[PDB]
């Protein structure tokens with residue numbers, strides 16, 4: 001198993017800014033899609049072990 | 050007041066190898082235990098650099114192109130200052146750096162100079178040890194002054210019996226002109242040393258002028274001490290720099306070497 | 307409640323058993339802090355506005371200025387100027403502003419001529435010795451000086467330029483004393499009919515009518531934003547705060563973090579510490595020299611542990627990798643709180659009996675719903 | 678011009694030169710109160726600066 | 727030989743002592 005990783009997609013892309021966070025809402029569900037992609041890996045590292 | 054001496058005809062300039070010399074801290078940022086790469090104007094390693102040495106007297110004019118490594122292995126402080134400018138006639142500002150036994154002056158009035166300007170160790174003239182005027186006539190449009198204490202003072206190690214190397218980098222960028230330097234003891238007859246040590250930023254100045262040529266000022270029918278000075282021109286490259294656990298640049302590699 | 311924050315995010319009313327991710331936790335900055343270099347070498351305002359004697363306006367002074375800080379608090383805030391007008395800033399904003407070259411012009415005039423020092427004017431002072439350009443973006447400071455520069459016999463030391471062949475250009479100065487020709491005839495020698503000596507001297511007497519009474523002018527001329535800055539208004543600074551999350555600024559290194567005292571020693575020229583990532587991890591204080599570790603304000607996922615909604619409506623919360631001592635800034639009432647390799651766990655009880663894993667909490671821990 | 682403009686000055690039309698800040702979208706300010714360019718507070722219908 | 731920007735690393739359910747135990 002490798003290191004589990006998880007990301008705040010707002011804090012990576014728009015860190016400490018509402019102004020950017022609004023422009024990110026325009027793109028919708030993508031951040032949750034990324035989160036799931038990482039949460040999937042992270043469950044499977046426990047499962048492999 | 051011009052004390053002209055066209056005494057030495059233009060000669061064929063010596064070259065010597067600059068090893069792993071003249072690296073300087075790029076910015077005021079501590080980085081430690083780390084192999085940081087960077088892009089800035091640095092002296093190419095192993096390059097031949099122009100070698101001059103003070104009947105041993107050397108006093109040429111030469112050009113400037115983004116930046117310089119100046120260095121000198123010398124005993125008893127014969128070397129003292131620098132002129133920088135783009136025309137050297139008062140059409141343009143031209144900055145001066147002069148040091149004496151201790152004090153520096155830095156001045157940006159449009160000095161009208163001489164073909165062969167210098168200062169010697171003052172005697173007679175006005176009176177013994179005179180103001181740093183002799184290079185030029187006109188100040189009257191004095192855009193700038195600045196002044197400081199020890200810019201190039203002595204180090205002991207039993208009375209400086211060795212020649213102690215003094216290294217200076219001169220740079221202009223974005224209207225800041227900047228200095229970085231080191232002084233160290235070594236025992237070597239006629240070369241810039243194989244070995245490694247970093248130049249830390251000594252002073253900064255928002256002069257904001259086109260700069261294109263330069264000339265060393267060294268003191269003296271006349272008799273004086275005599276030693277080497279070296280000029281190498283910096284280049285746009287990429288370095289990998291090793292900073293030790295204490296955040297000092299301890300070794301460097303020149304990617305293009 | 308955190309349970310609704312699952313139901314919302316999962317877009318479901320009944321929820322199955324498990325641990326579920328929600329919005330991340332992130333501590334809000336306790337205050338803003340501003341750390342700048344001490345106001346140090348102030349500009350020569352005592353020599354400019356407080357120089358004992360002034361020039362005559364015909365031969366108007368130009369005191370060039372550089373390498374200093376331009377605090378005006380001992381300037382605008384003092385009532386000693388009956389006419390300070392700025393023409394291209396709020397005079398309040400000056401301390402929060404910067405200037406390229408500076409030239410303090412200093413001279414004396416009649417009060418009924420002070421108006422002619424404003425840009426775009428006519429009358430002998432504007433026409434023949436001092437004439438501001440129509441886009442003047444300096445500032446102008448003038449005051450009655452009857453009690454300083456008036457003389458019982460008239461202060462004929464101060465003088466205007468009454469006659470001129472033509473009306474002059476902005477920032478032209480004339481030291482001519484050659485004889486003005488008011489007629490078509492040429493003028494020779496020193497004097498004659500329609501020959502005139504071109505200066506005249508002010509009858510500044512203390513008895514003079516207000517307007518007629520002498521007035522001191524300083525023009526703060528500056529030409530701006532075409533070369534590197536060497537004079538600026540004072541960058542005001544504030545007390546240092548520690549062991550709290552804050553929005554910081556050091557010397558224009560703006561950012562946010564918990565500030566802590568560093569063991570790192572920086573060589574005397576350095577001010578910032580940067581990581582392998584080249585991210586800023588430490589900073590020197592620019593007043594009270596010491597090195598500070600920047601630690602970015604404590605943050606991590608909120609994960610809500612639940613038995614299925616088809617079983618119970620009691621839940622628990624993990625703040626992932628947060629020390630319990632940081633959660634109270636936010637259920638910070640606590641009552642059931644436990645601290646773990648995984649984070650801070652809130653809303654659950656610890657039991658020494660090692661059951662089989664049920665809901666995984668990570669780092670050796672699982673949780674379950676039991677008697 | 679042909680409907681609204683008169684040779685000595687149709688001053689019946691006014692704008693606003695000063696304000697506490699920048700007005701919000703579709704906000705209308707009817708205010709007439711004396712603006713303070715200077716530091717001094719300024720009760721009454723007029724005052725210096 | 728072996729947190730920033732919203733990026734985070736999550737710990738394993740089976741801690742090295744439990745792996746040492748299963749082994």
Ligand SMILES: *[C@@H]1O[C@H](CO)[C@@H](O[C@@H]2O[C@H](CO)[C@@H](O[C@H]3O[C@H](CO)[C@@H](O)[C@H](O)[C@@H]3O)[C@H](O)[C@H]2NC(C)=O)[C@H](O)[C@H]1NC(C)=O
Nearest residue numbers: 351352353354355356357379380381382383384385386387
């Ligand atoms: C020209 O020089 C004058 C002498 O230095 C200077 O007067 C000084 O004005 C300041 C500020 O008005 C006074 O500072 C004190 O003000 C009050 C007392 O009146 C105190 O509450 C404060 O704490 C502060 O100490 C000085 O007392 C005063 N100096 C004297 C002795 O007269 C002018 O302001 C200067 N003007 C310019 C244009 O530079």
Ligand SMILES: *[C@@H]1O[C@H](CO)[C@@H](O[C@@H]2O[C@H](CO)[C@@H](O)[C@H](O)[C@H]2NC(C)=O)[C@H](O)[C@H]1NC(C)=O
Nearest residue numbers: 148149150151152153154178179180181196197
């Ligand atoms: C070294 O150079 C300094 C800087 O020019 C000299 O200091 C000046 O000396 C004159 C005469 O005493 C003063 O009028 C200046 O005001 C001094 N400058 C400053 C900034 O203080 C110094 O005299 C020189 N010393 C020697 C040994 O040459």
Ligand SMILES: *[C@@H]1O[C@H](CO)[C@@H](O[C@@H]2O[C@H](CO)[C@@H](O)[C@H](O)[C@H]2NC(C)=O)[C@H](O)[C@H]1NC(C)=O
Nearest residue numbers: 140141142143157158159189190191192193529
């Ligand atoms: C030296 O003096 C000359 C002449 O006073 C300066 O040239 C002036 O520069 C300003 C600023 O760019 C211009 O507005 C003027 O038109 C220039 N006048 C002339 C006659 O050329 C020059 O800038 C001065 N240099 C320094 C360093 O002070």
Ligand SMILES: *[C@@H]1O[C@H](CO)[C@@H](O[C@@H]2O[C@H](CO)[C@@H](O)[C@H](O)[C@H]2NC(C)=O)[C@H](O)[C@H]1NC(C)=O
Nearest residue numbers: 081082292293294295296297299570571572573
């Ligand atoms: C970094 O610098 C420090 C300080 O100069 C060095 O620590 C010193 O080590 C010497 C030799 O053991 C001792 O005499 C000093 O007492 C130490 N200084 C302190 C403040 O404890 C350290 O060795 C340097 N590290 C490297 C890698 O050069």
Ligand SMILES: *[C@@H]1O[C@H](CO)[C@@H](O[C@@H]2O[C@H](CO)[C@@H](O)[C@H](O)[C@H]2NC(C)=O)[C@H](O)[C@H]1NC(C)=O
Nearest residue numbers: 342343344345346543590591592593594595596
């Ligand atoms: C900023 O100003 C303060 C003084 O206002 C300087 O700090 C002083 O340092 C001395 C010597 O340690 C102490 O005796 C004083 O008590 C300190 N003053 C204060 C207010 O703490 C400080 O040096 C200045 N900043 C810089 C960079 O020099």
Ligand SMILES: *[C@@H]1O[C@H](CO)[C@@H](O[C@@H]2O[C@H](CO)[C@@H](O)[C@H](O)[C@H]2NC(C)=O)[C@H](O)[C@H]1NC(C)=O
Nearest residue numbers: 627628629630631632644645646647648649650
């Ligand atoms: C959570 O943080 C606290 C400090 O706020 C830690 O408590 C410290 O623990 C060490 C080791 O036992 C002691 O030396 C300190 O004196 C304790 N400090 C305080 C303020 O009590 C605690 O260990 C941390 N826990 C975790 C899981 O990280």
Ligand SMILES: *[C@@H]1O[C@H](CO)[C@@H](O)[C@H](O)[C@H]1NC(C)=O
Nearest residue numbers: 063064065093095096097098
């Ligand atoms: C160095 O100098 C030698 C002359 O001794 C010359 O042939 C050579 O091209 C020079 N190389 C560089 C890189 O300047």
Ligand SMILES: *[C@@H]1O[C@H](CO)[C@@H](O)[C@H](O)[C@H]1NC(C)=O
Nearest residue numbers: 173174175176177178179180
């Ligand atoms: C030399 O003379 C100048 C005046 O010309 C005087 O100011 C200075 O102090 C004198 N220096 C010494 C060392 O006597």
Ligand SMILES: *[C@@H]1O[C@H](CO)[C@@H](O)[C@H](O)[C@H]1NC(C)=O
Nearest residue numbers: 135136141258259260261262
């Ligand atoms: C000097 O500066 C001027 C203006 O910036 C520029 O046009 C000119 O090319 C410069 N000359 C040199 C030799 O760099």
Ligand SMILES: *[C@@H]1O[C@H](CO)[C@@H](O)[C@H](O)[C@H]1NC(C)=O
Nearest residue numbers: 320322323614615616617618
């Ligand atoms: C779900 O809830 C119902 C009551 O609404 C209960 O009768 C049933 O046993 C529950 N089903 C499961 C799968 O737990």
Ligand SMILES: *[C@@H]1O[C@H](CO)[C@@H](O)[C@H](O)[C@H]1NC(C)=O
Nearest residue numbers: 644654655656657658659660
């Ligand atoms: C559980 O056992 C631990 C020792 O393994 C002890 O520290 C703790 O107090 C016990 N808890 C209870 C509730 O008895």
